[PDB]
Amino acid sequence: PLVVEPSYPDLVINVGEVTLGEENRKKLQKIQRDQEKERVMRAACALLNSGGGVIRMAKKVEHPVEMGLDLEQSLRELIQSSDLQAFFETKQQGRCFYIFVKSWSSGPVKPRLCSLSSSLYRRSETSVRSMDSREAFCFLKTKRKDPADLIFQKDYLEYGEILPFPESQLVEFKQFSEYVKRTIPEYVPAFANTGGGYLFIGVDDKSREVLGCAKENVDPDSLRRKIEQAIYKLPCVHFCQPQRPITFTLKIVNVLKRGELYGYACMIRVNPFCCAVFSEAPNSWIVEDKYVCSLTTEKWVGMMTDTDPDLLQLSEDFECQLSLSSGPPLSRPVYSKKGLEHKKELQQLLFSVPPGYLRYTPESLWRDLISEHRGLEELINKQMQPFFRGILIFSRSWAVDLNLQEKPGVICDALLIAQNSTPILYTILREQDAEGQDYCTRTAFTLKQKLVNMGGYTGKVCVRAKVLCLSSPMDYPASYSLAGTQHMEALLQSLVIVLLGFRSLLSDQLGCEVLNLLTAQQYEIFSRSLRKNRELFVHGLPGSGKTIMAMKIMEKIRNVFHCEAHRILYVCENQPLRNFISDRNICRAETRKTFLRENFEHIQHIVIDEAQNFRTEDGDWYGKAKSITRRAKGGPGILWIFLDYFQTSHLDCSGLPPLSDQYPREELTRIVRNADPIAKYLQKEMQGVQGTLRIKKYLTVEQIMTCVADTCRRFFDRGYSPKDVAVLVSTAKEVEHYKYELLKAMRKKRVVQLSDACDMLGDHIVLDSVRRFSGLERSIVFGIHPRTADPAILPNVLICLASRAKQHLYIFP
Ligand SMILES: Nc1ncnc2c1ncn2[C@@H]1O[C@H](COP(=O)(O)OP(=O)(O)OP(=O)(O)O)[C@@H](O)[C@H]1O
Ligand SMILES: [Mg+2]
Ligand SMILES: [Mg+2]
Ligand SMILES: [Zn+2]
Prior knowledge:
Name: Schlafen family member 11
Helix content: 25-40%
Assembly: monomeric
Number of helices: 25
Keywords: phosphomimetic, ATP binding, monomeric, hydrolase
Distance between the termini: 71 Å
Strand order of the largest sheet: 1-2-3-5-4
PDB class: hydrolase
Radius of gyration: 34 Å
Organism: Homo sapiens
Structural class: alpha/beta
Bound molecules: adenosine-5'-triphosphate, magnesium ion, zinc ion
């Protein structure tokens, strides 16, 4: 079997012994030549889809060689072209021979996967054949949006009778003999996938005279079960519903010699299939940990057919930084809300290319490292002399920045990008360690994999690991080194998406793991080390991202502190928000009441969100929070606090501690959520995208409900779903009357759906009290009489209403 070796900084496949050189190769018999060609083909196919790699063939001949005539054409067919140099390069090291395989790139249409054979067949006039990836993709995309019968109806035939028509796109005749097996998969998929038709078994293929083997050959009662089992064993795939099995019919007709029963003949009719049917699983491969495993039929067909999803908040305001229609196979699409920074503006702002000097980065972090640590400057300025220009990106650990546990004893990591050299990964160990090399190797491994899986880098990239200290790689070919400004900028841009990318909340509404790009401010906040920032009172406007960074930080804490995901405790005020965050299972979750009630003896890290809506009515939460966090055996765990501090009174004794004691501090100063008019109006009250703001006054409750029903009708007439709307009121006790009123007024338009905020899973309009609802959001929000029934809830409730409406806000004061 193919074996994957872990000790390398990029994916390496060793195929065992191989003999190359056409003069040397052609001597070998096929039962070995083709076997080894197929092993190498498995390797190459696997790596062209799994984000690139290196193939490592061993040999027992030491002189230089050349690609064999068979392999240099199998690679061309597999890549679907003769431009081998673009994807494969040859370099050998004596008895070891390497070919370095880029990662496939669907973008300039070319398909999204590379596979030896698609296993799909179709009838072309008189011929049957397999399909190549381009034709397979065209066919799958297309299916994503009588003389024969008068013979079939005959119940018997005589030996030697000539059938009146030849073979065609509709029919075939097959001579008989073991032959009762394997004969069906050859032709049946060909007919089903297009046109449908018949195949006659027991009839000469050329003379067309019936022969029907003989009595001793066929037992119809067994042949029927055999043929049906063979038919229904062939894998199929559907995009439609319900899943119809293979539609077919059979006749096992007695056939006579001189009028005497002499044998049997079979006529099988195959009807056009509503979807694609595969003779066998496509011969395609993708490599997982330690194993290069085949792709299943459903996985294959799904992968080849994926495309960028569309919806109201996926279009006209979201910009496609990466697409499934131009990136590698395994890349998830990425987006960035219109009006924020792209991937381009972000790397300019974070990793701008110098013209003539090797800029370090991040400047502040370099300052902290050099001041903190003795001789780091001395150790590094030596090993930066050769490289001329580029960037050197530092961090206190590149493992935790890529979702791998930070290692004890690491001083920092650094990525070295420079012109006329490959990117290089530096880790500066505090002291030499036996296991130290493993950390740098695996970190290089994962950074490389992410740079082309998550990064979406169509280009040709390699990463190398170096272990420094304060106290035999693959000689990648010459073309993998950054040859100018353009390619350096491309690689930096596809590092921007490795770092600033996070799993969007639209993954719930779409199912696919759509990634999204942070802002500069949030990245600045997120980059802070944890072991030096045990406490932090983050600020920011409402709807600016506090929840995002909160969620991210329970992953970062889990990585850094080696703690199980259940020891990190979240806290909040509203049950709906805790519901929205409880299911992620990245943490244990609570609300402030039970937070005081419960005895958290197993908690070691706390992240308090929307803190400004807390209250002392049951006791003190801040004191207990410090008591828990600071009692940890392993040292004081995080106690990050989030909150809102627009220019409005917080009040309360524990409406955040005294403002002079809120330090250290950070500021997320942008309202990404809402649209322009909502942002414009929302700013006035606190004193890039279209939307609507509608305030109506002096309307009766009857008129108000008529208007909201009419607007729901209008929006659903434009694609908005039941889950795209919300109608909110002041208090919970006011919910009951208005629920009934709305369900009534909606009768005139015969709308039916209404459910609370707790029932968030169903596609129903959500109605609840704002204080209860706070923490969530919907595309359209209706406000029914927001009023200061209890000014203990921060008096500015018109903000907690207008902050929930992404694109359309309707206010009824
Ligand atoms: N980088 C980003 N680009 C675009 N939109 C983003 C980004 N980060 C977050 N958002 C969106 O902005 C909104 C704010 O979400 P989040 O819950 O984190 O904010 P918040 O200020 O904590 O909210 P709340 O106070 O209402 O609980 C969400 O719709 C979120 O999907
Ligand atoms: Mg024929
Ligand atoms: Mg929030
Ligand atoms: Zn179907």
